Amino acid sequence: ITHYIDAAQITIWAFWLFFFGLIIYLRREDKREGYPLDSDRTERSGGRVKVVGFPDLPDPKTFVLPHNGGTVVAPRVEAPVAVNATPFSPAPGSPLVPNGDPMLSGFGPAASPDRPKHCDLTFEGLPKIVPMRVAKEFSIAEGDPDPRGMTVVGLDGEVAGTVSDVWVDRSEPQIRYLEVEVAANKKKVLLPIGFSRFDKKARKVKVDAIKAAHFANVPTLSNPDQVTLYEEDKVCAYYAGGKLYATAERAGPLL
C-alpha cells in the first residue's frame, strides 16, 4: 500500500512545531532586561501604552544572592535616569550630543548604569578584587615583569604617572586593574587591564583611551582597599569615553 504521508514527513513537521515554541520561549527570556521599551508612544499616551512587542514579558524570576546579599528580580521596574545630553536634531531617531566637557558628561561611551554600592565577593565572603598590598599571598608569575614601578603613558605618549600597585581577582587569580599614582595630583586611580598595553623592555604601560592629563579626572574610590560594582563601572566607562572623546579626530568621519 502507498501513502503520501510518511514518518519522516510527520517527524519534520513535529520538529517545526517544537522549534517555533522554543523561539517564543527564548524571546521571552530575552526581555528580562531593558523592557518595556522607552518610546515616544508611551510619552504621549501618558504612560498608558507599554511597548513590549511579541512575545510579552515573562513573569519575574528571582536571583538569591549569597552571604545574605538580598534578592534580584528580573524583569524589574527601573527608574528613568536623566540623560546629560541634548538631541542634535528634534527628529525621532536622531543622536544626542553630550553637555559640557564630553569626557565628564557621563553620556555616550562615557555612560554606565549605577551598579550596586557593594563589592563582588569571593566564595568565602571577602572582597574579590583587591590590591596586592592587601592580598599578600599573590606574586608575579616568574618570567613576567612586575608592573609596579612602570611608567604609565597616555595616548599621546606623555607620562601620566607610575604604577603604584596591582589589583587582582582573589577568586580567579589574574590582574584586573593597575593602580596609578597620577603625577599631576598624586591621587591613586584604577586603570583597567583591558585598556593597558605593556611595553615590557621599556617598562611602560601604554593607554590609548585617554591623554596623560585626563588621568587627573579618573573616578575615585571611596575605600582604598576594595572596589564596589558601582565604582568598577564608573572607572571603566570613564576610559571608554576617551575612545570617542579624547581627541577631535576620534569623532570621525574619515571622509
Partner 1 sequence: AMLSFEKKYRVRGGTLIGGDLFDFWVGPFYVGFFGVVGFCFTLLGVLLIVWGATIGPTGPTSDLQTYNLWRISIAPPDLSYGLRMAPLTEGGLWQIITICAAGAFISWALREVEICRKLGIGFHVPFAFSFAIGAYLVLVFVRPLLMGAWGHGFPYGILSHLDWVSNVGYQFLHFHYNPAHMLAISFFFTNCLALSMHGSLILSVTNPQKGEPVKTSEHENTFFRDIVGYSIGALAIHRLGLFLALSAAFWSAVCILISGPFWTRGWPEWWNWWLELPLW
Partner 2 sequence: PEYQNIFTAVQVRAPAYPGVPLPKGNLPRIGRPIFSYWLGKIGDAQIGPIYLGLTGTLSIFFGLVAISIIGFNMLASVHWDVFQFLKHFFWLGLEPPPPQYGLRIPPLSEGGWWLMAGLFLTLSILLWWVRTYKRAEALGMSQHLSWAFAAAIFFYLVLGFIRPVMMGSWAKAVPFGIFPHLDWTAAFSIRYGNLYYNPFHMLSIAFLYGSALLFAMHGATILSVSRFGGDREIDQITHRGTAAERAALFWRWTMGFNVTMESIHRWAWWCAVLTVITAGIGILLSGTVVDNWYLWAVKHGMAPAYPEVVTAVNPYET
Ligand X SMILES: CCCCCCCCCCCCCCCCCC(=O)OC[C@H](COP(=O)([O-])OCC(O)COP(=O)([O-])OC[C@@H](COC(=O)CCCCCCCCCCCCCCCCC)OC(=O)CCCCCCCCCCCCCCCCC)OC(=O)CCCCCCCCCCCCCCCCC
Which residues bind to ligand PEF, rule: CB under 6 A? 11, 14-15, 17-18, 21-22, 25
- Alpha-carbon dihedral of residues 222, 113, 120, 73, nearest 10 degrees? 130
Question: Amino acid identity of 213?
Answer: A
Q: Applying CB under 8 A, does 255 fall inside the site for partner 2?
A: no
Radius of gyration of the chain from its Cα atoms, rounded to whole angstroms:
25
Q: What is residue 59's DSSP assignment? A: P
The grid coordinates listed for 249 are 579626530
| Residue 211 contacts partner 2 per CB under 8 A | no
> Should residue 16 be labelled a site residue for ligand X when binding is judged by CB under 6 A?
no
Q: Is residue 222 packed enough to be buried (19+ CB in 10 Å), middle (13-18) or exposed (0-12)?
A: exposed
* Residues in the chain after which the backbone breaks (C–N beyond 2.5 Å): none
For residues 22 and 89, give the distance between their C-alpha atoms in angstroms, rounded to a whole number: 41
Select from 54, 62, 90, 201 the one that contacts ligand X (CB under 6 A). 54
**C-alpha–C-alpha distance, residues 137 and 255, integer Å:** 53
Binding string, residues 144-183; x marks residues near partner 2 by CB under 8 A: xx-x------------------x-x-x-xxxxx-------
As a residue count, the chain comes to: 255
Nearest to 203 by CA among 155, 131, 138, 144: 144
Nearest Cα residue to 116 out of 232, 32, 34, 218: 232
Going 81 to 84 to 86 to 88, the CA torsion angle's sign is negative
Closest distance to partner 2 from the beta carbon of 115 (Å): 5
Which three three-digit cell numbers place residue 168? 587582582
Question: Is residue 29 a contact residue for partner 2 (CB under 8 A)?
Answer: yes
- Among ligand PEF, partner 2, partner 1, none, the one that 145 touches (CB under a kind-dependent 5 to 8 A) is partner 2
**Min dist. Cβ of residue 195 to partner 2 (A):** 6
21 or 125, CB closer to ligand PEF? 21
CB of 22 to ligand X, least distance (A): 7
Site string for partner 2, 213-232 (x = CB under 8 A): ----------------x--x
CB of 157 to partner 1, least distance (A): 21
* Interaction site with partner 1 (CB under 8 A): 33-39, 41, 51, 63-67, 69, 78, 80-81, 83-85, 88, 91, 93-98, 106-109, 111, 113, 121-123, 128, 169, 171-172, 174, 240-244, 250-255
Q: Which residues bind partner 2 (CB under 8 A)?
A: 4, 6-9, 11-12, 15, 22, 26, 29-30, 32-34, 63, 65, 72, 111-113, 115-116, 120, 123, 132, 135, 137-145, 147, 166, 168, 170, 172-176, 192-198, 200, 206, 208-209, 229, 232-233, 236-237, 239-240
